[PDB]
Design an enzyme around this catalytic site. Structure first.
Site, mmCIF file in Angstrom:
data_model
loop_
_atom_site.group_PDB
_atom_site.id
_atom_site.type_symbol
_atom_site.label_atom_id
_atom_site.label_comp_id
_atom_site.label_asym_id
_atom_site.label_seq_id
_atom_site.Cartn_x
_atom_site.Cartn_y
_atom_site.Cartn_z
ATOM 1 N N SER A 55 0.822 -1.211 0.000
ATOM 2 C CA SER A 55 0.000 0.000 0.000
ATOM 3 C C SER A 55 0.855 1.259 0.000
ATOM 4 O O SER A 55 1.506 1.576 1.000
ATOM 5 C CB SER A 55 -0.937 0.018 1.201
ATOM 6 O OG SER A 55 -1.770 1.164 1.151
ATOM 7 N N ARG A 56 0.852 1.959 -1.138
ATOM 8 C CA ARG A 56 1.674 3.152 -1.312
ATOM 9 C C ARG A 56 1.289 4.266 -0.338
ATOM 10 O O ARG A 56 2.152 5.004 0.146
ATOM 11 C CB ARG A 56 1.522 3.657 -2.745
ATOM 12 C CG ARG A 56 2.048 2.726 -3.827
ATOM 13 C CD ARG A 56 1.836 3.349 -5.197
ATOM 14 N NE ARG A 56 2.319 2.536 -6.301
ATOM 15 C CZ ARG A 56 1.627 1.602 -6.937
ATOM 16 N NH1 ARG A 56 0.417 1.289 -6.519
ATOM 17 N NH2 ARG A 56 2.043 1.149 -8.095
ATOM 18 N N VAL A 57 -0.011 4.409 -0.058
ATOM 19 C CA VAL A 57 -0.552 5.334 0.940
ATOM 20 C C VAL A 57 -0.229 4.947 2.381
ATOM 21 O O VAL A 57 -0.197 5.817 3.258
ATOM 22 C CB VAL A 57 -2.072 5.470 0.717
ATOM 23 C CG1 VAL A 57 -2.752 6.224 1.846
ATOM 24 C CG2 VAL A 57 -2.344 6.174 -0.602
#
Lengths: 119, 55, 254, 57, 124
Positions: free
Chosen positions: C117-119
């Site tokens: 998950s980049r966020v």
């Protein structure tokens, strides 16, 4: 560009010592995992200890981390990278603990972080 | 399926690497232990023949 | 529409792949030049037209949201195929579920190794950020050590310890069906796991340690949960350890 | 039974037959002083008369 | 042709034996000779970047390698021997270069050892 005619004589000898150290660590971890770690020879134990520090001190504190984690970070000129790795490979600083070496920009910063830990 | 065999190849390659490395280190301990035994073998020959004749 | 009013929204698409197949059949009947597989070349644009309406509008626009959860069914653990690579390039993260994990007892089966998950990190509450960040490190380190060293019977002591911590970690992350756990009692179980209070307890008994502990945590410790509810903050470590140590007095080991 | 080695001790314990003496995790280079302790104990058992015959496998 | 066939067998035999080589003490000298020869062989076959070698000195270095004159020479300094040899052989060894250019054949063997020995002494 890693040739003495382009980069420099010391830079070539330093970089090849670093890569040989990490390559010898990459082939020693499974023996460390499944034989007793005391079974590694004292010369290979030296290569292990310095490969731990080298692997961490290639990490660096960053301005872009200010969003994700908030810390300041900084910029390192070439001379201070190459000299600091000459300090790592010489080994007098091997007493400072491995945890300090993460997210730093100079070996003086590594002395400071340990200083907070009090080492 | 194709992505099923690749995982089996990768896992076996890792186990193959672990077994080869343990072959190297066992060879080193074998050669030393045989030399060590041969070091204590003249002690066994000497002691056996004096302890018998004195006994 | 609800996001323009300013209320948070969530959209779920139960299978995007069947939408893609309906496009293929519709386009082929229309005599359009085909591409890989036979999917028409427009597919990536069609899904991007769908998936880029999701947003978090600014305070000048109302503060709304439109989170989206698309699903794709892969054929036999297929990857590098046309629809999965398109969607995996568009979305800001991906969860990969493994069938061989599911039939091995991990539920819901989620592979930490291939899911990103980049966020991540920013979204979590501050209490969660401290405990969940270290948990990622622990489980990554044991994922590699177990992948090779589990076949041999006996290892180095420090590795037998890390193998024990990873096995307890996956057993403590097993969960039941349609029984959501509120965040307040998630952080308190993950904290109990990472700080190593679960060494005494056996791997089989853990799903009962959770069960008997969450009841205890509603019988005692309500102030802890209240501080976490609105502050988003981890309570004082003296009182949290006092709470877990009392429960470990009550719970009976097999 | 007198067993030198963990997997030997494990089998004997499941079988339940008693193990009068034990030692384990010897260094891969064994030296005389290490196994002098067990050697002096086992021969001490024979010499003091607690055993009538003795074998090695 | 004389020095090529011996070199071919030397690399073929060392490449498999190197897969087992790292122990240092394994068998008696019979195994080691193949270690010693293979190590010097691999040292001699490396080349500096972009500088091409001349043929009659190429033949003479391969002869020096494949006949065993290098066997006493310590392994660490094996390369430096080639650099010093190429210039010295031009100064002191010209008769051998003329011989190869004359004959397509190895230098007259009688004085070949003596001429190589003078270089071997000149190398330090």
């Amino acid at each position: 560009a890693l040739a003495p005619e382009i980069v420099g004589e010391e830079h070539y000898q330093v970089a090849r010592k670093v890569q040989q150290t990490l390559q010898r660590y990459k082939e020693l971890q499974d023996i460390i995992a499944i034989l007793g770690m005391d079974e590694l020879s004292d010369e290979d134990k030296l290569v292990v200890h310095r490969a731990r520090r080298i692997q961490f001190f290639l990490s660096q504190n960053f301005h872009v981390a200010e969003q994700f984690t908030g810390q300041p970070g900084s910029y390192v000129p070439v001379k201070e990278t190459v000299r600091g790795f000459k300090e790592i490979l010489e080994g007098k600083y091997d007493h400072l603990p491995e945890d300090a070496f993460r997210l730093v920009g100079r070996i003086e910063e590594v002395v400071e972080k340990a200083k907070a830990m009090g080492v | 399926s194709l992505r099923d065999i690749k995982t089996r190849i990768n896992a076996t390659k890792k186990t193959s690497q672990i077994t080869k490395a343990m072959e190297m280190v066992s060879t080193s301990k074998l050669n030393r232990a045989e030399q060590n035994a041969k070091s204590f073998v003249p002690y066994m020959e000497k002691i056996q023949e004096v302890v018998a004749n004195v006994a | 529409y609800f996001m323009y009013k300013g209320k948070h929204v969530l959209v779920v698409y139960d299978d995007l792949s069947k939408q893609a197949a309906a496009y293929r059949e519709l386009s082929l009947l229309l005599r359009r030049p085909p591409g890989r597989e036979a999917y028409p070349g427009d597919i990536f644009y069609l899904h991007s037209r769908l998936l880029e309406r999701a947003a978090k509008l600014s305070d000048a626009k109302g503060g709304g949201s439109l989170t989206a959860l698309p699903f794709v069914e892969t054929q036999a653990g297929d990857i590098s195929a046309y629809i999965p690579t398109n969607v995996i390039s568009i979305t800001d993260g991906q969860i990969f579920l493994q069938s061989d994990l599911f039939f091995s007892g991990v539920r819901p089966a989620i592979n930490a190794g291939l899911s990103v998950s980049r966020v991540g990190g920013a979204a979590q509450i501050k209490a969660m950020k401290k405990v969940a960040g270290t948990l990622r490190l622990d489980l990554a380190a044991y994922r590699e050590l177990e992948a090779f060293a589990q076949f041999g019977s006996d290892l180095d002591k420090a590795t037998q310890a890390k193998l024990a911590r990873g096995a307890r970690t996956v057993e403590v992350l097993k969960q039941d069906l349609h029984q959501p756990i509120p965040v307040e009692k998630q952080v308190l179980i993950i904290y109990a796991l990472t700080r190593g209070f679960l060494d005494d307890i056996p791997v089989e008994d853990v799903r009962r340690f959770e069960k008997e502990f969450y009841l205890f945590l509603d019988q005692n410790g309500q102030h802890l949960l209240e501080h976490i509810r609105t502050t988003k903050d981890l309570p004082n470590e003296d009182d949290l350890n006092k709470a877990i140590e009392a429960f470990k007095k009550t719970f009976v080991v097999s | 039974i007198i067993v030198i080695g963990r997997v030997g001790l494990s089998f004997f314990r499941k079988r339940n037959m008693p193990v009068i003496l034990d030692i384990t995790r010897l260094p891969d280079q064994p030296s005389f002083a290490d196994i002098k302790e067990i050697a002096r104990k086992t021969v001490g058992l024979f010499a003091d008369g607690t055993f009538d015959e003795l074998y090695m496998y």
